[PDB]
Amino acid sequence: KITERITGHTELIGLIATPIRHSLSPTMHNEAFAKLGLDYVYLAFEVGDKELKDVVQGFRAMNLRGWNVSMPNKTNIHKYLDKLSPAAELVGAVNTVVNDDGVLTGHITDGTGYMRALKEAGHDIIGKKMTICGAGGAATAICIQAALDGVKEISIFNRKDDFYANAEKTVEKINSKTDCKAQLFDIEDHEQLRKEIAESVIFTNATGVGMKPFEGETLLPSADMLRPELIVSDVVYKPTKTRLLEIAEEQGCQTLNGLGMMLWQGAKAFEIWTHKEMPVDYIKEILF
Amino acid sequence: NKITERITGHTELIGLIATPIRHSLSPTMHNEAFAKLGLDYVYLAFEVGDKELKDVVQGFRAMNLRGWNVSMPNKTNIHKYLDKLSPAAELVGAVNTVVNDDGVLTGHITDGTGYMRALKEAGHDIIGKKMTICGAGGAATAICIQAALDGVKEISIFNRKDDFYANAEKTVEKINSKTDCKAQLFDIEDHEQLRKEIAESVIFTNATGVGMKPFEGETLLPSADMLRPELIVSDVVYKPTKTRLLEIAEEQGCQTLNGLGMMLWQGAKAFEIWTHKEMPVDYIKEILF
Ligand SMILES: NC(=O)c1ccc[n+]([C@@H]2O[C@H](COP(=O)([O-])OP(=O)(O)OC[C@H]3O[C@@H](n4cnc5c(N)ncnc54)[C@H](O)[C@@H]3O)[C@@H](O)[C@H]2O)c1
Ligand SMILES: NC(=O)c1ccc[n+]([C@@H]2O[C@H](COP(=O)([O-])OP(=O)(O)OC[C@H]3O[C@@H](n4cnc5c(N)ncnc54)[C@H](O)[C@@H]3O)[C@@H](O)[C@H]2O)c1
Ligand SMILES: O=C(O)C1=C[C@@H](O)[C@@H](O)[C@H](O)C1
Ligand SMILES: [Cl-]
Ligand SMILES: [Cl-]
User: Is residue B111 marked as binding?
Assistant: First the structure.
């Protein structure tokens, strides 16, 4: 007569970030575990700077197989891990940890997730030019992966905030370690932005503009910077159409929000922990 | 809804830390209770021993867990890492249940209370009377202390001359110095003393592993004629559901009770400490067969 699948044999996969309780990640992974008959459950914990160290040490002692990491912990957690994948070390951010016999390896799946979503949607940018806004965890993961996957040129735009120096490092990494050509400009350099967009096959927002507390706002100065043939992409998926995507759709452009990136960054994390492919079509149908 | 999993980012965790522990039925009990009441919690077990305890408790503080159960080998050491203790947890020196309020961890002991509640629910009134009990391990210690704190008048403990005998001596000292209960300890080999004690008791209880694997079919009772029809015979063991002791008790006409109620009511007590809602015990008993 027992109907709860969770017993004393059930193992835990975590998610540590704050705020985080409205995340769709637990639903995604729990539905995937249930579909494949795997005895795991995925839970979120509200963890910030003050809690991170103790939580990781606790997870080691609890022998957790792995967990995801989100804001504000992606760029700090490496300190508490043992090894980093090549991409996590290049990016300087971790969103996924796996525990192999007590050895914690940090991985980053946001970039690979973004690129897979483009590919699955039919958008080929390999050997071509991208203009992207942002220089935080998401943008850095995307820029590095785009370069590793063979995108030809990347023009990065960011405001002159604390992340601008990070973008400068990203430019140096891309130019020295890959065959991709990268440059950085101020987002307020509107004439350069117009030129870079014109010369690109895709324009991507990888900032929080367009998502609360910037819903209805955009970093795009004019709709006339977007020709109909341009692909316009946003990492944001709540709302499902940012102001940027709305303006692009009105101009006749193909658009893509962040739902695919969310699915694929999760699919990759799932496979790292379980060595099984996430049933993506099934999960997409029920959740995205 | 296409979504069938009840676990989301809102779901909170209640733990269980002990080793070995993965065959525990506690997670089934609490998860079925949470689901029945529509409470957004899940209960999970973790293999935690001496080497992991400090780090796990610190981690649980940082994860802001509402609470957790504790079992062997951590019940007598965990107080080191907590902030407050209930009176019984302090006196017993063991904690099986922790709750977190605004970062302050309070240790509670619920197996004794569970034992006493199960007797009351079965219609057995032992308050103001004498209990004779076999054992001096975790279960016996908690039952003896709790029984004394709850008003049992006299407790006679019987234990073999093993490494637990010294613990029983400590239990006697605690009861006689901190309560008005009159406690005494004897060797289980003192059959003539056992006859006297049982004859004078409202209840005779087994709180040892005898009667459960690797001692199934065995009993510590020397003679059936030490029992009488008015006596209550109780066993902490519930697998099997009728130990050899309970069979003999039934043969002598005694009232009997196994340890299933103790298990359920200790869970009910912890469930309220965490959720401040009453556990549906009858519902849980039915789902556990
Ligand atoms: N779809 C997905 O799976 C997915 C995955 C990761 C991140 N994201 C999203 O990506 C966005 C960025 O996340 P992150 O982790 O890189 O954040 P971060 O804090 O690491 O970086 C923030 C970036 O946004 C820029 N920015 C912030 N506010 C700005 C403003 N008012 N004007 C101009 N620029 C501004 C910063 O300069 C920086 O480039 C968030 O909306 C997040 O939800 C989506
Ligand atoms: N119903 C419940 O909820 C519940 C809760 C806790 C424990 N229990 C049961 O209580 C029993 C004891 O558990 P514990 O945690 O107190 O164990 P423990 O290891 O802490 O103590 C063992 C006790 O049994 C005695 N003993 C063991 N073998 C003996 C033998 N051959 N002859 C005489 N005495 C012997 C020891 O002297 C000691 O008093 C177990 O069977 C356990 O499953 C039931
Ligand atoms: O909110 C979430 O659930 C997540 C967001 C992204 O940062 C991901 O990188 C992370 O793995 C999960
Ligand atoms: Cl597979
Ligand atoms: Cl213990």
Answer: yes
**Residue (of B133, B103, B160) closest to B233 by Cα position:** B133
Strand A129-133, strand A202-205: pairing:
parallel
Looking at the fold, whether B203 and B276 belong to one and the same domain comes out as no
Distance from first CA to last CA of chain A, Å, rounded? 33
Asked if the bond preceding B222 is cis, omega within 30° of 0, the reply is: no
A62 vs B27, B56, B289: nearest CB: B56
Does B235 share its domain with B153? yes
User: Would you give the DSSP letter of residue B69?
Assistant: E
Ligand 1 test: best mutation among A110, A140, A143, A207, most atoms within 8 Å of CB? A207
Domain count across chain A: 2
Helices (H) and strands (E) in chain B, counts: 10, 12
Catalytic annotation, pick one of A1, A35, A50, A74: A74
Place of tokens 């992974």: A29
Q: Is B162 annotated as a binding residue?
A: yes
CA-atom Rg of chain A in angstroms: 19
- Name every chain B residue with its beta carbon within 8 A of the beta carbon of A25: 9
We report the CATH number of the domain holding residue A199 as: 3.40.50.720
Q: Which domain holds residue A266?
A: 1-110+262-288
Identify the residue whose C-alpha is closest to ligand 1 atom 21.
A136
Q: Determined by which method?
A: X-ray
**CA–CA separation, A7 and A145 (whole Å):** 39
Residue corresponding to tokens 């049992």: B152
The angstrom resolution of this structure is 1.5
B153 is catalytic: no
Which residues make Cβ contacts (< 8 Å) with residue B13, sequence separation at least 6? A12, A43, A45, B41, B42, B43, B44, B63, B65, B66
CB pairs under 8 A between A and B: 120
